[PDB]
Design a protein around this ligand. Structure first.
Ligand SMILES: *[C@@H]1O[C@H](CO)[C@@H](O[C@@H]2O[C@H](CO)[C@@H](O[C@@H]3O[C@H](CO[C@@H]4O[C@H](CO[C@H]5O[C@H](CO)[C@@H](O)[C@H](O)[C@@H]5O)[C@@H](O)[C@H](O)[C@@H]4O)[C@@H](O)[C@H](O[C@H]4O[C@H](CO)[C@@H](O)[C@H](O)[C@@H]4O)[C@@H]3O)[C@H](O)[C@H]2NC(C)=O)[C@H](O)[C@H]1NC(C)=O
Ligand SMILES: *[C@@H]1O[C@H](CO)[C@@H](O[C@@H]2O[C@H](CO)[C@@H](O)[C@H](O)[C@H]2NC(C)=O)[C@H](O)[C@H]1NC(C)=O
Lengths: 227, 184, 135, 128, 184
């Protein structure tokens, strides 16, 4: 008898994916976020659209999905479809094509101790206003803004993921070995910042998001040689 | 959050999304409609089409979706899939070649009073008569006519949330300046 | 809306409405479907692709005697809005499309009147074949 | 159409639309394949692809969908949504855009002897 | 079809597609992977994308999908929808702007021994470094990295079917000639 089936029925026979993983309503769910860029596909100046391929890494705790390996034959990880668990519903707010969500609904990994990890890949087409003044010798500042589509800052908050040494990864992660630079665009900088706002008395509930700022430089060789 | 699970099981045991959400059929559903313009994506002068990114904030009370917070562990608001409940069917009456209605069914915020706020995103492609007499120094008046496609005023009433569209989160355009905006 | 809830329960659950079956007493009968077209706007006629793009509101009218009721036995209700997936539909398509969109764009509610008339006004964006005479 | 409802209920009790109809192991299902060309939309030389609008014409026998008309008010044929019956998985193998299937599933016409005729529309972009 | 109908109803009575298809969780799922290249659709040098038409033959064994043919009238193989069963989640890691995983869910061939063959089609749009130095006489060494996105080698192992991609059903290209091909 596969112990994965026993664990799956133990964690999900009584589980509501529509309710947040909080014991009290006023509690907040802390979401650790990393964004990894695999490719910068293009920057279309005419449509002012940045097309990128990324995978988002989202970690959090769900006390209802808590189990010990000793009670389940030494299982330390359970892969399950993302549709069966509560999700923070992270979306790219500044998309230009109406596509808010991720490209592929990968399985969530449920570790012992209630830790939930979701690593969906995504293709994003985002608004990037092109500063034309020095084109083709120009550099651009394209933002990627991520926020929960449903929950306010009191319900879900964000923190950055940490590396092995514990240093906060407050930037876009890029795997150097697997990275191929865009033919026309070099990524010079990519900081990330967690913003919180609209916490005023008149405004009411607070709001938060995570903005990454790709500072990208054009390689002007084509325009130099041909035009 | 077992309180929320029990509450949601209670609210939708014998609920119907086909039926208009008021206690008596002779009453009118009062819907407050507000438009937030996020971006003026493009003006197509040839086909006479204005494409924009908008948020269509709709507010209305659902008579049957009420509860006492004290009976459910202090829960005063919840988030519900929009497909599950009755909604007004707002349509862009002057849609050019885009979607007629909302296609992104995001979650609604439901209060214990029964008040529902639903702020779906949409890309509106509207038909705007383009006068090219003074092009490139032309001024264009582009409208977005919104209404309940299948409900008349005697059953569902729509009212504006504000005299003007919300342009607080409007991204700057590199081709157009919005001088004036208004809802009637 | 206690009365329309009761009326919908009566029409669809009590009497067992089957939307797969046509509204006829015998299989040999035919359902009269009345059609009208309203042109909201002529989007374009692409000459190179020979395609006409139009926005049209198709008015469909038919009779479904299974969906009749006395308005006075149900609180003077005379009309009902229903999702189109609950009722039998006369599936009309644009035969001469050239992109593969045979069907209407937005499946809006049907209006059902107490005397059995079903009114349905789906709007659609259609891309149709228009051969071009260039002479 | 109460007679049609009773006939449909009789025909689809225990019917599995995912199981190929073979009364015995080894029986082959004979599928007749024809094509009607409604329009030759284009031949793109840049993309090397032919775009056409067609109606397929598929015919096959499903022994499970047979009945005696005299026991069913003389109903000699039925029109059924294609997803409700077993279909042969006939596809355009040489499509250029990744689309293998028909444009609209529509309805099959089933005769009392189990003969099934299906004429789905298709917009196909094939490699040429 | 009565025999296969009863067999399918038995097989999916108590089936789970969530858990891995092993008798013991400490066992590894051995997946044989073979890529067949049907067509080389396009090489976009500007955006560095290679578009190909492929069949991704995947073979494994499902422990719980076995039966005795004698108990079911001699049925030794069947075809079942792929969405009902556990599958490996192969992803093109260097996908550029297409689909990351298989989206066309064609039928799996299931043997009575539990052996599953699943040969879905796909359009792979792969990011690849394009060297234009010798254009128009340039050679391009492009790649397609495939792997199980959410499973590691300790729970699911992938092995190549062959040392080379299957080019037996490859349509000739009017712009490129495949000098060499190999899977590692
Ligand atoms: C690439 O693109 C990114 C994104 O655009 C750039 O980052 C942004 O740069 C802006 C400057 O150009 C930053 O805006 C300034 O931030 C200063 C930080 O001080 C804080 O101010 C807080 C005040 O309240 C903030 O939040 C509320 C939220 O409701 C908002 O309404 C306010 O406007 C304000 O942002 C305060 O609470 C906090 O403790 C800090 O003190 C701020 O001081 C600046 O204000 C000066 O300038 C404004 C100009 O309008 C003026 O009105 C003020 O009086 C004052 O002089 C700015 O607000 C912005 O925060 C950056 N966003 C990030 C990092 O997420 C990035 O620079 C670009 N890179 C390039 C070009 O290389
Ligand atoms: C998941 O369950 C384990 C086991 O109950 C929890 O670990 C226990 O934590 C308490 C303190 O909170 C200790 O007193 C126990 O000794 C621990 N384990 C044992 C052996 O009972 C763990 O904290 C739970 N995780 C979450 C997220 O609640």
């Amino acid at each position: 008898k596969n112990e994965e089936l026993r664990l799956y029925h133990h964690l999900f026979n009584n589980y509501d994916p529509g309710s947040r993983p909080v014991r009290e309503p006023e509690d907040t769910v802390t979401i650790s976020l990393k964004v990894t860029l695999t490719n910068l596909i293009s920057l279309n100046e005419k449509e002012e659209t940045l097309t990128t391929s990324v995978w988002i890494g989202i970690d959090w705790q769900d006390y209802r999905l808590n189990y010990s390996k000793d009670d389940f034959g030494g299982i330390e990880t359970l892969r399950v479809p993302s549709e069966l668990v509560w999700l923070p519903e992270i979306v790219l707010e500044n998309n230009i094509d109406g596509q808010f969500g991720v490209a592929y609904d990968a399985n969530v990994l449920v570790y012992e101790g209630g830790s939930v990890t979701w690593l969906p890949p995504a293709i994003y087409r985002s608004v990037c206003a092109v500063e034309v003044t020095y084109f083709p010798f120009d550099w651009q500042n394209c933002s990627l803004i991520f926020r929960s589509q449903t929950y306010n800052a009191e319900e879900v908050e964000f923190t950055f993921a940490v590396d092995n040494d514990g240093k906060t990864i407050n930037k876009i992660d890029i795997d150097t070995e697997a990275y191929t630079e865009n033919g026309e665009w070099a990524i010079d900088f990519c900081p990330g910042v967690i913003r919180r706002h609209h916490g005023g008395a008149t405004d009411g509930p607070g709001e938060t998001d995570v903005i990454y700022s790709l500072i990208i430089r054009r390689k002007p060789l084509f325009y130099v040689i041909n035009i | 959050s077992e309180h929320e699970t029990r509450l949601v099981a209670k609210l939708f045991k014998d609920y119907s999304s086909v039926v208009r959400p008021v206690e008596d059929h002779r009453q009118v559903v009062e819907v407050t409609v507000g438009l937030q313009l996020i971006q003026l994506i493009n003006v197509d002068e040839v086909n006479q089409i204005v494409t924009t990114n908008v948020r269509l904030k709709q507010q209305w009370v659902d008579y049957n979706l009420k509860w006492n917070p004290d009976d459910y562990g202090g829960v005063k608001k919840i988030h519900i899939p929009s497909e599950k409940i009755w909604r007004p069917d707002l349509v862009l009456y002057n849609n050019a070649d885009g979607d007629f209605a909302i296609v992104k069914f995001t979650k609604v915020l439901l209060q214990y009073t029964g008040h529902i706020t639903w702020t779906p995103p949409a890309i509106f492609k509207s038909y705007c008569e383009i006068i090219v007499t003074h092009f490139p120094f032309d001024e264009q008046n582009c409208s977005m006519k919104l209404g309940t496609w299948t409900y008349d005023g005697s059953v569902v009433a729509i009212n504006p949330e504000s005299d003007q569209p919300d342009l607080s989160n409007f991204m700057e355009s590199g081709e157009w300046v919005i001088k004036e905006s208004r809802g009637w | 809306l206690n009365e329309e809830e009761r009326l919908i329960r009566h029409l669809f659950q009590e009497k067992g409405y089957n939307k797969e079956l046509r509204p006829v007493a015998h299989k040999e009968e035919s359902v009269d479907v009345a059609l009208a077209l309203t042109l909201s706007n002529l989007i374009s006629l692409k000459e190179v692709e020979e395609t006409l793009t139009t926005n049209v509101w198709i008015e469909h009218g038919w009779t479904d005697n299974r969906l009749k009721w006395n308005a006075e036995e149900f609180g003077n209700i005379s009309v009902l809005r229903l999702p189109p997936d609950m009722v039998w539909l006369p599936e009309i398509v644009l035969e001469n499309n050239n992109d593969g969109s045979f069907q209407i764009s937005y499946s809006c509610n049907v209006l059902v009147y107490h005397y059995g008339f079903v009114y349905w006004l789906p709007p659609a964006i259609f891309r149709s074949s228009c051969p071009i005479s260039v002479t | 159409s109460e007679a049609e409802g009773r006939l449909r209920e009789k025909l689809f009790s225990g019917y599995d639309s995912s199981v190929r109809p073979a009364r015995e192991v080894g029986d082959r299902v004979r599928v007749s394949v024809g094509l009607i060309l409604a329009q030759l939309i284009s031949l793109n030389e840049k993309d090397e692809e032919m775009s056409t609008k067609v109606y397929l014409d598929l015919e096959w026998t499903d022994y499970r969908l047979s009945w005696d008309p005299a026991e069913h008010d003389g109903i000699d044929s039925l029109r059924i949504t294609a997803e409700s019956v077993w279909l042969p998985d006939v596809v355009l193998l040489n499509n250029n855009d990744g689309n293998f299937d028909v444009a609209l599933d529509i309805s099959v016409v089933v005769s009392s002897d189990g003969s099934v005729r299906w004429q789905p529309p298709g917009i196909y972009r094939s490699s040429c």
